[PDB]
């Protein structure tokens, strides 16, 4: 079913061909999920810059390239949110929230068990998240598929609590 999802991902994004290439910028990003020194090895990676430049396009190319494969051998399946498209007022289960993005749901719940060994997770935005979010009261949920509000769920992945030994972009 993963091959079917990969083909579905391919059809979703075919806007530009110049952005998707095996540039040496790729081998830096692939080397980013590697220990710079033998003592310390990173897991969370932040790409920041001026809003106008193609940050979203760069993330889109990473999504498209994974369907072509060979982008990341330590890494199974991408989860793509765009916070501009969907509001965060309502509350729905994390498994339900990711069920809308991905075509199939029966494999998705079984996919979570295989996530910790090798994982991808991509975010766009959150600049409007922080201002809207009050941060006066906060909660942490340590289990998946729980019916929880999105921003408390979103806080959970970042702290590595809900996904131990995970990887971030």
């Amino acid at each position: 079913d993963l091959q079917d999802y990969k083909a579905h991902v391919i059809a979703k994004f075919d806007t530009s061909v110049d952005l998707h290439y095996d540039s040496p910028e790729m081998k830096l990003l692939s080397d980013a999920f590697k220990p710079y020194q033998k003592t310390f090895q990173p897991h969370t990676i932040i790409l920041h810059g001026r809003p106008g430049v193609g940050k979203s396009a760069l993330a889109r190319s990473i999504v498209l390239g994974w369907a072509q494969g060979k982008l990341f051998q330590k890494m199974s399946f991408v989860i793509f949110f765009s916070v501009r498209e969907i509001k965060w007022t309502e509350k729905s289960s994390l498994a339900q929230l990711i069920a809308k993005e991905c075509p199939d749901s029966w494999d998705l719940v079984t996919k979570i068990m295989s996530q910790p060994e090798r994982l991808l997770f991509v975010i766009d935005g959150l600049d409007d998240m922080d201002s809207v979010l009050q941060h006066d009261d906060m909660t942490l949920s340590r289990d998946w598929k729980d019916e929880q509000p999105i921003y408390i769920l979103m806080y959970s992945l970042l702290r590595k609590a809900l996904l131990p030994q995970s990887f971030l972009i």
């Binding site: 910028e25 830096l28 990003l29 980013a32 920041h48 430049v53 193609g54 760069l58």
Partner: protein
Amino acid sequence: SLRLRTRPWWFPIQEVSNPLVLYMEAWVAERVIGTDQAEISEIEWMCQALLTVDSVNSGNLAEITIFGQPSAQTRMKNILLNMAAWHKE
């Protein structure tokens, strides 16, 4: 086009905003920097500034990028020019 470069946690986000690019002849510029990445990082920490050089144009001109506080940007430029002067002889 695009360009990527890692940013240390010690550096302030505000400091990253101003470039301090300096234009010097490419043969004079790339030779001073050196190929050893380890030596670059040691110089990077001592001055509390960021250094990144790229010579993509086929012409004999090269550009350098330095990031930091105005007092720190001065320190690296003076040393880099001094080493450039040394390479002449």
